[PDB]
UniProtKB/Swiss-Prot annotation:
UniProt record, GO biological process: electron transport chain
PROSITE patterns according to UniProt: 2FE2S_FER_1 (PS00197), 2FE2S_FER_2 (PS51085)
Cofactor binding description: Binds 1 [2Fe-2S] cluster.
Xref: CDD domains: fer2
Ranges of residues in domain 2Fe-2S ferredoxin-type: 3-95
SUPFAM superfamilies registered for this protein in UniProt: 2Fe-2S ferredoxin-like
The encoding gene: petF
Name listed for the protein in its UniProt record: Ferredoxin-1
């Protein structure tokens, strides 16, 4: 499967659409497709890559920085998240945690 991923940057007011294989992390796919996103650790252990889900689901079992509560609130670490349905996500959300 290949899911459609819509990236929204609310502060600049941009929207980019990418197609992501089900076994590829969102970040990787964005980059290949021409869209640079913020990242540091690239390993699920920081908050740099944070986005917030608007709709759809992901699989981010490889993350380790977010707590249950944050994940439930919709936060996602884009560098370790596989889409598992079409997804609409707001990027550059790191500040939303502090
Ligand atoms: S780059 Fe650190 S959690 Fe994604």
């Amino acid at each position: 499967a290949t899911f459609k991923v819509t990236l929204i940057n609310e502060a600049e007011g941009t929207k980019h659409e990418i197609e992501v294989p089900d076994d590829e992390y969102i970040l990787d796919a964005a980059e290949e497709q021409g869209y640079d996103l913020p990242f540091s650790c690239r390993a699920g252990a920081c908050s740099t890559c944070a986005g917030k889900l608007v709709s759809g689901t992901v699989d981010q079992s490889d993350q380790s920085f977010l707590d249950d509560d944050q994940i439930e609130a919709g936060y996602v670490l884009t560098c370790v998240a596989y889409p598992t349905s079409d997804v609409v996500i707001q990027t550059h959300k790191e500040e939303d945690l502090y």
